[PDB]
Amino acid sequence: EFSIIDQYFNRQSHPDVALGIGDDSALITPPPNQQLVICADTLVAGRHFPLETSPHAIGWKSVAVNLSDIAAMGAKPHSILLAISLPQVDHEWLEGFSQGIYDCCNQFGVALIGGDTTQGPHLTITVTAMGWIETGKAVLRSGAKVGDYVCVSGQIGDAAYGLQHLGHSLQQRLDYPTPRCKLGEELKGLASSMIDVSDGLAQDLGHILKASKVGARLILEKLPVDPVLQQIEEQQRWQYALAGGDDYELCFTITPQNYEKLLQKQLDVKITMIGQIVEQTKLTFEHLGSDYPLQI
Amino acid sequence: EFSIIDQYFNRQSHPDVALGIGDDSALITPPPNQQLVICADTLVAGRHFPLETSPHAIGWKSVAVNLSDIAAMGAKPHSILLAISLPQVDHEWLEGFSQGIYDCCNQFGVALIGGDTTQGPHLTITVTAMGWIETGKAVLRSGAKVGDYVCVSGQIGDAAYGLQHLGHSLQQRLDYPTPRCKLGEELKGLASSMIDVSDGLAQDLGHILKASKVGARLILEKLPVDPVLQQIEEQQRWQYALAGGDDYELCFTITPQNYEKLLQKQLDVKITMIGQIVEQTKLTFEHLGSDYPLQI
Ligand SMILES: Nc1ncnc2c1ncn2[C@@H]1O[C@H](COP(=O)(O)OP(=O)(O)NP(=O)(O)O)[C@@H](O)[C@H]1O
Ligand SMILES: Nc1ncnc2c1ncn2[C@@H]1O[C@H](COP(=O)(O)OP(=O)(O)NP(=O)(O)O)[C@@H](O)[C@H]1O
Ligand SMILES: [Cl-]
Ligand SMILES: [Cl-]
Ligand SMILES: [K+]
Ligand SMILES: [K+]
Ligand SMILES: [K+]
Ligand SMILES: [K+]
Ligand SMILES: [Mg+2]
Ligand SMILES: [Mg+2]
Ligand SMILES: [Mg+2]
Ligand SMILES: [Mg+2]
Ligand SMILES: [Mg+2]
Ligand SMILES: [Mg+2]
């Protein structure tokens, strides 16, 4: 177990880490005039990923889903803790898994600074992520105002389709979600509210609506879906997009004025306006310019 | 699961929390001139606690073992995240478990500011603890010097005895360890090195010896054991004390000069000098003034 840490999880720490792996706790010197942003998310084998998922993909997604919650605040990710409960000690598995962890960390300039390694009957992983943001400038789930656009990044429904069609190209969106870190940072001071879409667009937008004490009207034909989902029947397409989940895209609200400023930035991801915030505290849908009753 | 969070894990925190439970991440405004101290430890049902352990004790210990690693740095604890994987939703269990979480947090002035709640086949808990310490003043596992006293707080072996004698009063030490938070803070500026005894005195002192590139000679009859263990045959007594684990006491090294200073403080726990640091890089034992060969 102590050898497991040294063998797989003790790459040299960044110069930006006061004390990394090796002691009872890690130490971080805060950057000035910034708040600590902190979150944790658990992945349970067979629940948050198929049992047969490659160890590298498990490692990647364990980090990615937590970076997504830092990004959903408009913050910049800094470091993570890794808590893993393992049924067995398998070198090939541990090599792939740790490679997955570090590949995702390195993509986004994040340090692995600590954690815990235990034995347990079922593979269970909890990553804690830490980031920093200019004091007072976090993008909350509250903050959405009547007249704001509702927007979402990338595509929604991919991962859900992937889960139900394993082996299909869209499985890559299930196994390797992309946390939208740079977009989150670019939305600081532009977005009036934000959440990452981890459970499903309707449910997660719903948290914003409830927190902001507003409602929204979405346009079904504007939901950004993969060409593959564009070719399946409407009803199923919209279910994948609205209740699929595991997208790890950012859903946010923004004034038309700030939206124009957003579109003028160089962004590493697609942005789509899918509706607007309204006064009535309900989530409703529009299609071809008419009300569209829809149960999700 | 959203009902669970609201019903059991959403009490108002200390004023020192910029944003607590309810958003994608929590926000903390760092106190000036302090470093973030951060750790995580997992408890797996049946492994880190007997399956029949009361939910209140499970909640208490989940927090306590993590406050212990904050204390082991000399730092002051501030807040925790709670990640729980639950096989079933049981109201009586959740009431007891959450009461245990909050009882430990409240005793030590700690806020529960976030976490994750999931379904899984086996009860698994990971708490992340966050604390703060004056920049540069952490007590590391490195730093022990030849001639330094080796010391330990409280009693060692209680929890291990309790585990093997479930039903005995010493089970209290297994179920309800006390993190030595105030002692940890009082050892800032005095201890030359420190670790908390979670795995066993010999093993955990061993991490200090390895990090400091020194050895130690312990005096077996000076080990602080319960009167109950004083009545056991000495070999088994010393095995509980040196290899029992789950003590969550602090083991630290300290100059004779600084030990005198320590004893002048008003402390909330027993402190015992049990040996001293030596040049040769080995852990050895002495009994009644003679070398005492002992395998842990
Ligand atoms: N999977 C992991 N990834 C990264 N760091 C880890 C991991 N597991 C453990 N660590 C780090 O390795 C060091 C030793 O960990 P550990 O033995 O769990 O310390 P501890 O909490 O003080 N003891 P214990 O309470 O018995 O678990 C610490 O600095 C941990 O933060
Ligand atoms: N057991 C818990 N104790 C304390 N806070 C919790 C707990 N579970 C969840 N929370 C908090 O409750 C809020 C909602 O949690 P959660 O639904 O897990 O958010 P999320 O990470 O954005 N979504 P997801 O990735 O699907 O898990 C967050 O502010 C969490 O930090
Ligand atoms: Cl273990
Ligand atoms: Cl779940
Ligand atoms: K730790
Ligand atoms: K947010
Ligand atoms: K979260
Ligand atoms: K330490
Ligand atoms: Mg420790
Ligand atoms: Mg999340
Ligand atoms: Mg640990
Ligand atoms: Mg989220
Ligand atoms: Mg520990
Ligand atoms: Mg979560």
Residue numbers in the entry:
A (entry chain B), B (entry chain A): 3 to 298
Text from the published report:
Thiamine pyrophosphate (TPP) is the biologically active form of vitamin B1 (thiamine) and is essential for all living organisms. The same study also identified genes essential for growth on nutrient agar using high-density transposon mutagenesis, and found thiamine monophosphate kinase (ThiL) to be essential. In this study, we present high-resolution crystal structures of ThiL from the pathogen Acinetobacter baumannii (AbThiL) bound to substrate Thiamine monophosphate (TMP) and substrate analog adenylyl-imidodiphosphate (AMPPNP), and bound to its products TPP and adenosine diphosphate (ADP). The AbThiL structures assume the same two domain fold as MfThiL and AaThiLwith an N-terminal A domain and a C-terminal B domain.
As part of the standard SSGCID pipeline, AbThiL was initially crystallized as apo protein and with AMPPNP/MgCl2. Diffraction was much better for nucleotide-bound protein. Initially, AbThiL was co-crystallized with 5 mM AMPPNP/MgCl2. Crystals from condition JCSG+ G10 (20% w/v PEG 2000MME, 150 mM NaBr) were cryoprotected in two steps with reservoir with 15% v/v ethylene glycol (EG), 5 mM AMPPNP/MgCl2 added, and vitrified by plunging them in liquid nitrogen. A strong anomalous signal for both sites (13.4 and 8.3 sigma) in the AMPPNP-bound structure was additional evidence for potassium, even though no potassium was added during crystallization. By comparison the anomalous density for the phosphorous atoms in AMPPNP is slightly weaker with 7.9 sigma. The anomalous scattering coefficient at CuKα radiation is twice as high for potassium as it is for phosphorous. All of the structures were well resolved: For the structures bound to the substrate/product pairs, residues Met1 or Ala2 through Phe304 or the C-terminal Ala305 could be modeled, while for the AMPPNP-bound structure residues Glu3 through Ile298 were modeled.
